[PDB]
Each structure stands twice: as C-alpha cells, then as structure tokens.
Amino acid sequence: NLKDKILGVAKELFIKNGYNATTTGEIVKLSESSKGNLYYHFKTKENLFLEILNIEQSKWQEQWKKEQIKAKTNREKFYLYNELSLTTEYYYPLQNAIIEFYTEYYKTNSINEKMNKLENKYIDAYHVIFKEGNLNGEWSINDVNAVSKIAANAVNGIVTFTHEQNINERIKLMNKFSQIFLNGLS
Amino acid sequence: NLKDKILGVAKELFIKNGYNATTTGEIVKLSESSKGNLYYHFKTKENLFLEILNIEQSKWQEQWKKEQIKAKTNREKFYLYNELSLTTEYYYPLQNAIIEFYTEYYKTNSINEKMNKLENKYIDAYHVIFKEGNLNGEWSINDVNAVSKIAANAVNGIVTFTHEQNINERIKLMNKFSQIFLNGLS
Ligand SMILES: CN(C)c1ccc(C(=C2C=CC(=[N+](C)C)C=C2)c2ccccc2)cc1
C-alpha cells in the first residue's frame, strides 16, 4: 500500500508533468513516503516507471479479456484488438511520459531487459489470436511467433505515425490494414 | 562550413539524444558558433528540425532511386524498399525524434501545415510502386493512397520498434511482412 500509493501518485505526476520533469523527491513527499522506502521498492525512477508500465500492462490485458467477448471469431478479435489499440491510445494520459521514457532509454541497453519482457507481453495477445485461429481453421500459420511480432509492430506503427488525420480516417485505415493482413494469410 | 555544420551537429544530437533532449544551446555551443547565428534561415528550433527532416527525406529518396534498379518487378520493388528501410542511415534514424516533435507541436497548427509536404514524400515511394503495379497488372488496387499510407506506416513500425534485435531477424520479419501484405492485395 505505501508502495501502491507511490505508484499511484507517481503515475499521476508523470501524466501531469511527463517523465523527465517528475522527480523522486516530489513522489516521495506527495505519497508521504521516504527516499529510503522508494529506493527499497524501485531503486530508480526508471525502474519505478517500468513498474507503472507493468501495472498498466496488466489493466490493459484485463480489459481485453472482457472486451474480446464482443468478438466471436479470431478474425474478429484481430480486427477489434487493432481498433482498440488505436482509439484507446488517442486519449491515453501516459502516452507522453512513455514517449519521453522510451526515446530516452533507447541508448541504455540495461533497461532493454524489462523493456522487452513488457513488449513481449503485448505480442502474446496476437500470438493467442493467431494460434486459436489455427485450431479453428480460420487460417493456417506455421510461423505464429513471427506473424505475431509482425502484426504487433505493423499495427503500432499505423497507430503511432498516422497521427496527422481525423479519428475516422484512422479507424478506416486501420480496418483496411487488418483486412489486407488477414487476407494475405490464405 | 557553418550553415551546413550546424545541420550536421543538430541531426547528430536529434538522433542520439532526442528532440526536447537537445536545445538551441547545445547545438550552438557544440558547433563553435553563437546564438545570433540563427535568424534569417534557421529562425526557430522547430524550423532547424523540419529542415533536417527535409534533407534526410531527400537523401533517402535519392538513395532509393539509385537502388531500386536492382528490382525488375514492382512486387520486388516493394520488398526491397522495406528491407533498405531497415539498413539506411537516412531519415528512418530520426523517427523517435519525430514522434516527440509531434507530441509537442500537434496543437500549434503552424506545423500541421508547414511539414505537410513531408508526409507525401514519405508515402510517395509506395504510391509509385502501387500505381505502376496497376499499369503493369501485378495487382489490382483501387484505394492506392490508403494502401500507400497503411504500408508506409506499418513498415515504419517494423523498422522503428525492432531497433535492438539482430539485424537479420529484422530483415527476416520485414520480408515475411512484405510477403503477407502484397499477398493480401490479391
Ligand atoms: C496504451 N497501449 C494500448 C499501448 C501503448 C504503447 C505500445 C507500444 C509498443 C509497440 C510495439 C511493441 N512490440 C510489438 C514489441 C510493444 C509495445 C509503444 C508505443 C510508443 C513507444 C514505445 C512503445 C502498445 C500499446
């Protein structure tokens, strides 16, 4: 809880002032904790931040569990999952803190460890989509892991770089992509 | 030089550190110049940046033409472009900086119009490839602009978010993508 209170406050601080601007000092004081306790729990602001990210990852996964029920078939889950990825990121408060962070630890190969266990978790969502797709003859992929890393990165690119259009066009392009992609698997 | 030495240091810092990460102070101090050195041509920092992007875009689009000749069919031109995208030293090594600049200059509509031509030179390569593929009957695509953007963005994704894993693994994926994509247009 004192740990949970720190992550909560830290998350808000980041959302409000971004990664670089937030200090562990602010965090310590606002969560009514101590430099010692924050050290014992996270060691560094970077670690603190990766922990928020993990928690955030969990929530996303959980939501997806409830949300994927609106998609009977896996072809549908693929369509749905990509759209959510697009819309939900449009209004995600942490997005900017993430970007600061990511484009700040691109050089540090130390963070590359947890940073990757995290990304892998996101790819599993797709991995599951495709596997189940196989066991239902929705398509036939023999290199799932591969197709999974590809979708995850192709879709995130559309989400991250399309930024330059009206939300409708984007959902449109994204659905066109999902269409093409799922097609080239038959 | 100087007007071309600034650009040199700037590009270097933008790539290495990041957009916000580097400021008009560092650029000058590291280029053996003065603050006044910027006014007529390089007014604002965002102008100096939008500059470097134009250069790099041209340098990459040029390298591409001096190399697409190794591809007879457009089907091959598609695959190639994507692979080269992973190996170049032009434009793509700045995506991270670009992503920030778009999260700190998306409001000021002074940019959304300023570097609007930049978004076209980026999707142009695929425009030609996809259009010329129609004439050559390699495929039948009606919504070219869509596909060009979908592809341009998906690809930038595979390139930007795999920057840490084995270059061969990268090129392998990029190829399975190109494979999957084009096959979905038929
Ligand atoms: C709020 N939200 C749903 C999300 C928020 C972020 C991501 C991301 C990402 C991109 C490629 C990945 N792969 C395929 C390794 C993993 C994560 C990501 C986006 C920008 C900068 C760094 C990572 C995905 C979903």
Q: Residue A59: CB partners within 8 Å, gap ≥ 6?
A: none
Q: Which of B22, B159, B180 best tests the A interface by mutation, with the highest count of A CBs <10 A?
A: B180
Question: A75, A180 in Cβ contact below 8 A?
Answer: no
CB under 8 A, 24+ apart: contacts of B159-163: B159/A157, B159/B85, B159/B86, B159/B92, B159/B95, B160/A157, B160/A160, B160/B92, B160/B95, B160/B96, B161/A119, B161/A153, B161/A156, B161/A157, B162/A149, B162/A153, B163/A106
Q: What was the resolution (in A) of this experimentally determined structure?
A: 2.9
Greatest alpha-carbon pair distance for chain A in Å reads 58
- Are A176 and B147 an interchain contact pair (Cβ–Cβ within 8 Å)? yes
Question: A15, A49 in Cβ contact below 8 A?
Answer: no
B154, two tokens? 């998906």
Domain boundaries, chain B: 1-49, 50-186
Question: A118, A54 in Cβ contact below 8 A?
Answer: yes
Technique used by the depositors: X-ray
- What is the fold, at CATH topology level, of the domain defined by B1-49? Arc Repressor Mutant, subunit A (1.10.10)
Q: Which of the listed residues A96, A122, A163 should we mutate to test ligand 1's pocket, taking the one with most ligand atoms within 8 A of CB?
A: A122
Site residues for ligand 1, CB cut-off 6 Å: A 60, 85, 88-89, 92, 98-99, 102, 119, 122-123, 152-153, 156, 160; B 161
Q: Which residues of A touch B142 (CB under 8 A)?
A: none
Indicate the CATH number of A50-186 among 3.40.50.2300, 1.10.260.40, 1.10.357.10, 3.50.40.10.
1.10.357.10
Identify which of B149, B115, B96 has the alpha carbon closest to the alpha carbon of residue B44. B115
**Fold match flag (A1-49 vs A50-186):** no
Q: Tokens 């919504």 identify what position?
A: B143
Q: Residue B121: CB partners within 8 Å, gap ≥ 6?
A: B57, B58, B61
B161 CA closest ligand 1 atom index: 11
Which residue is closest in CA terms to ligand 1's atom 23? A102
A27, two tokens? 């965090």
Tell me how crowded residue A25 is: count the other CB atoms within 10 A of its CB.
10
Question: B83, B175 in Cβ contact below 8 A?
Answer: yes
R_g over Cα of chain B:
18
Cβ burial A63-100 (10 Å sphere, 16+ → b, else e): ebeeebeeeeebbbbbbbbbbebbeeeeeeebebbbbb
B54, two tokens? 């134009």
- Measure the CA–CA gap between A129 and B52, rounded to whole angstroms: 41
Q: How far apart are the first and last CA of chain B?
A: 52
Q: Which of B82, B126, B144, B149 best tests the A interface by mutation, with the highest count of A CBs <10 A?
A: B149
Q: Which residues of A touch B102 (CB under 8 A)?
A: 163-164
